[PDB]
From a paper:
FtfL is a key enzyme in C1 metabolism pathway. It catalyzes the synthesis of formyltetrahydrofolic acid from formic acid and tetrahydrofolic acid. Formyltetrahydrofolic acid is then converted through two reactions to 5,10-methylene tetrahydrofolic acid, a metabolite for biosynthesis of pyrimidines and amino acids. PaFtfL exhibits a tetramer in all three crystal structures, consistent with other reported FtfL crystal structures.
To further investigate the structural mechanism of FtfL inhibition by BBR, we determined the crystal structures of PaFtfL apo enzyme, PaFtfL complexed with its substrate ATP, as well as PaFtfL complexed with BBR at 2.0 Å, 2.3 Å, and 2.6 Å resolutions, respectively. Structural comparison among our crystal structures of PaFtfL-BBR, PaFtfL-ATP, and MtFtfL-folate suggests that BBR overlaps with ATP and tetrahydrofolate on binding to FtfL, indicating that BBR likely competes with ATP and tetrahydrofolate to bind FtfL active site. Through structural analysis of PaFtfL-BBR complex, we revealed the interaction sites of FtfL, namely “active site” and “allosteric site. Comparison of the structures of enzyme–substrate complexes PaFtfL-ATP and MtFtfL-folic acid showed that the FtfL binding sites of both substrates significantly overlapped with the “active site” described above, suggesting that BBR may inhibit FtfL activity by competing with ATP and tetrahydrofolic acid for binding to this site. Each protomer comprises its own solvent-exposed active site close to the protomer interface. Structural comparison reveals that PaFtfL adopts essentially the same overall fold for each of the protomers and exhibits an identical active site as in reported crystal structures of FtfL from other bacterial species, indicative its conserved catalytic mechanism.
Residue numbers in the entry:
A (entry chain A): 4 to 558
B (entry chain C): -2 to 558
Write the structure that this text describes.
């Protein structure tokens, strides 16, 4: 059975019945049909919390296919519901753009999904459109100020703010606008990002309430003046209207899994130029309404988990009680020199040389951040017991239990082995959580702390332009913020070919930007694509609608 | 006529007690299985209800007005007032109106759906994202542009000439910066360099085809007929050639369901669509008007601008493609507007001027002759009364209008609400039950483009002929050779006058309209004709209204209106 067939034959409950499972009245939610609803964030102010625990699901350095990190979160959440616990699965919302290029995807996979799958891949509750409308209003007010008076003395060559659209349109990567008559604006270079790559999205996810959201949108640096000083959205008096555009969008979206477990999908920025987690207000909503929250971070534990802990948790004042490290025997054998085609041969030798990658993420989670961790093995069909005994053998050496996950084929029943081990880590495991770095350090000291402790590098090298940018950010006062390293996800290093666990390498930083709205410094290692393109035969050509309004060709 | 205890539109809207939308749905025999809730005050009506219920064959009431003036007319408030009035009279009625775009909200100000005590609520949501119809229009518009540029970049096997790409992107913002752009810059993997531009989302042809589709099947067909470019041979390239109309209809699947809201008095109100009244027809969607006529006994809808533009496009475009016929027409006018057509300045409009009232009255009399003697529809003049309107002024309008065989009913819906439109509504009930309807189109399909433009300019506008530029004569002929000569025409001229001249007020006579360009909207199904330059993308003022909008610690928005 395909993922689209499992979702259709599933019987989803009325979302008002899902809300009763977390003690939410019908005056506390706003329906979007029978199967979707938004939760008023003011419930956080008139009801007391349940002080729920936080479960973070990460994974080893990924292969182009994946390791089932999202299916593991949904399956473990369903498993904890099978154990009688009150649980919410906090996940990200996909973007609509890639649906029309490489076709859509299920919120999860197999029997560990989130439903309705069709609305999630499309407009959902309109959160993407709200993000893009606030992004494009600030850009329209920025160009309007330069056209009317430019009393802020903005240099058009130094405008870093970019418009956005929820489409895979390579045509809009590099743009000249403001052409035509003198009443048609100020001519300058510009461009479009995909909406999820916008800084509005990152500040949307790193806001604890509506008051902090408006303050963060005001801190957004949109350009620089001719004197070199930053110009903020607050200087343009735009953050008040931007917060109004995002007023309803900031309300988390309540949905359900295939087994009726309450699910919350909210936000979803990049995991390279941003932190790649769901919104703070959705995570803290789950911890307010449930006893256990299963969330995740994009890419491997060297990026998403590092940014979940050093950026999201630092701004939310929260802390994970357990970490689930997802790993597959295919990915470890892929790290052991095996190609994608030969991933099915029982190669115990290549599994051992790809294991240091899994063991490195185990050391980062358990010894650097000091959080109890458990290795969840996403059992792909052809795994052998000798393969599963070797990965269980060397994970015992550093004091981490290994549970076998079968949530893709069995749903919640397949995650009981992982669920129980997480519940025991919350009871047993001591928690001495420490950040990878402190705020007082400079930008270069924070990057060196991440590169040596987490990545395993000897140090960080900076180009001539990066040194100029880092120093200018220090002079402007942005040296007290966290740093967001944008590098490849397929490797611990910045070289996407160095698989396994690289040894004597150094990170080369070539560009640094400021995301003062989200509250971190973006540090780029290579070139990052913020607007993907459409393939030769886009999937949109196969999408159709019948006489009753049923969509075909989406999945 | 005047509000005894004056309140702004916000104070009236927030002091109002709106019913649950499921209780509004019960007033039109719609169960909770037929509606998708968007909160407790907004809902979407499944369009497959018309395939499961017997139609009530409701009556259609079009609300129009004289030419727009700087003094105001009140065509939107009159629509809500008459609908609330019919509800007070025991009638099962629905008000069908347009949805505003979010763009002008951050420019100058946000406006109530109406005003005074003739409003539609929830006001805050309608002016903002509402149920997301505008976003789906823009998504489908920009998807077509993305696949158009992708095809040209990948193979260009359709032989599209990049200089001849008419399709533009859109955004629901007032951003003059995006009027004229050049994109596709950078490396070879960054597309094909060409000139481009952005329209405001309500100006997209997708929006025009969105309102002129009877069902989702016609929508997919209309979107496929959209002409996006021309090849080097001169032949049109359509969205169907790009295999895009199926995906565009999927983006517009939920959006095609009309939105169900309510007035201040609990009357069911359907808001769906809202394009321009110059480059398009300026009406709410056909499926919304069909929905009301299927579920109600009377439907009150409106058309943008004066009767020379919106009512003409309602009858010659929308009514033609929907197969419906208006039973009664409401011509809304104010005494101060007719005195403005008489030569009185905007600051002297409050003085009683009986002679200037008769000099500007030929404007109202011209629209009456168009509704009653050209389309042959029973009409009624609804005077939006103001406190300073003397009895001599009101008696002069009633005298001159009753010569054409049309009654004049006073309207006080702004200050009194539903009971301020009883006189107008009962005058409309008399026209439907008594007067005969020999509805005729202004022209027919078989005529050439220049014959349809001549029939409109002479019968409706009062012109002696139509003059064409050299550039217009070729474009008309190119559309004739390509087989677009059997489509209605949508004249894009000024709204402030019956001519193409903004300053000739009242009733100009010895003039001629001057066509300067002619485009094709094969998706909506009409040929666009222009007498001047059109602003498809407004700009922000020096101090935009967005600087005043704020949100508090609890999520309450202020400064919006
Ligand atoms: N044990 C399994 N057997 C077979 N297929 C699986 C298994 N686990 C996951 N998958 C498939 O892999 C796909 C992607 O999984 P998932 O998205 O959870 O991984 P991910 O790491 O979150 O992906 P990404 O990192 O690309 O976001 C799903 O569609 C699912 O069907
Ligand atoms: N009789 C009246 N007295 C005072 N104010 C009125 C009256 N009628 C209408 N208005 C005001 O005029 C404003 C606009 O009226 P309305 O929208 O009905 O006019 P319109 O020109 O037909 O529509 P639009 O203004 O949207 O183009 C409303 O805000 C309303 O408050
Ligand atoms: K989405
Ligand atoms: K709107």
């Amino acid at each position: 059975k395909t993922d689209i067939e499992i979702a259709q034959e599933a019987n989803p409950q009325d979302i008002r019945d899902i809300a009763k499972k977390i003690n939410l009245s019908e005056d506390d939610i706003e329906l979007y049909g029978k199967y979707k609803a938004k939760i008023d964030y003011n419930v956080l102010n008139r009801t007391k919390s349940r002080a729920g625990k936080l479960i973070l699901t990460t994974a080893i350095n990924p292969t182009p296919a994946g390791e089932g990190k999202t299916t593991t979160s949904i399956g473990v959440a369903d498993a904890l519901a099978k154990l009688g616990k009150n649980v919410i699965a906090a996940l990200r919302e996909p973007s609509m753009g890639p649906v029309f290029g490489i076709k859509g995807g299920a919120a999860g996979g197999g029997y560990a999904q989130v439903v309705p799958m069709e609305d999630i891949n499309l407009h959902f509750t309109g959160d993407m459109h709200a993000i893009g409308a606030a992004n494009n209003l600030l850009a329209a007010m920025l160009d309007n100020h330069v056209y009317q008076t430019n009393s802020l003395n903005i240099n058009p060559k130094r405008i870093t703010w970019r418009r956005c659209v929820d489409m895979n349109d390579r045509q809009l990567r590099n743009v000249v606008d403001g052409l035509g008559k003198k009443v048609d604006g100020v001519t300058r270079e510009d461009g479009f990002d995909i909406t999820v790559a916008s800084e509005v999205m990152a500040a949307f996810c790193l806001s604890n309430n509506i008051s902090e959201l408006k303050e963060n949108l005001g801190n957004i640096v949109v350009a620089y003046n001719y004197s070199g000083k930053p110009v903020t959205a607050r200087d343009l008096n735009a953050h008040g209207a931007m917060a109004a555009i995002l007023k309803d969008a900031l309300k988390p979206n309540l949905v359900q899994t295939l087994e009726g477990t309450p699910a919350i999908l909210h936000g979803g920025p990049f995991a390279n130029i941003a932190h790649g987690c769901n919104s703070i207000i959705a995570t803290k909503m789950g911890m307010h309404m449930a006893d256990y929250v299963v969330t995740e971070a994009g890419f491997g534990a060297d990026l998403g988990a590092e940014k979940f802990l050093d950026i999201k948790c630092r701004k939310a004042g929260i802390r994970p009680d357990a970490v689930i490290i997802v790993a597959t025997v295919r990915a470890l054998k892929y790290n052991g020199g095996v190609a994608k085609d030969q991933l099915n041969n029982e190669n115990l030798e290549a599994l051992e040389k790809g294991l240091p990658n899994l063991l490195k993420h185990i050391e980062n989670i358990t010894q650097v951040y000091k959080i109890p961790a458990v290795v969840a093995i996403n059992r792909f069909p052809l795994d052998t017991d000798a393969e599963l005994a070797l990965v269980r053998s060397k994970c015992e050496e550093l004091g981490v239990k290994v549970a076998l996950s079968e949530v893709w084929a069995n749903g919640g029943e397949g995650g009981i082995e992982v669920a129980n081990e997480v519940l025991k880590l919350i009871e047993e495991g001591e928690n001495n959580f420490e950040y990878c770095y402190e705020e007082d350090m400079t930008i270069k000291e924070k990057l060196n702390a991440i590169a040596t402790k987490i990545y395993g590098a000897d140090g960080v090298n900076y180009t001539k332009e990066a040194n100029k940018q880092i120093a200018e950010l220090e002079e402007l006062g942005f040296g007290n913020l966290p740093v967001c390293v944008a590098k490849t996800q397929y490797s611990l290093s910045d070289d996407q070919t160095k698989l396994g666990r690289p040894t004597g390498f150094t990170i080369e930083v070539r560009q640094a930007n400021i995301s003062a709205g989200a509250g971190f410094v973006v540090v780029m290692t290579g070139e990052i694509m913020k607007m993907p393109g459409l393939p030769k035969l886009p999937a949109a050509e196969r999408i159709d609608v019948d006489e009753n309004g049923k969509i075909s060709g989406l999945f």
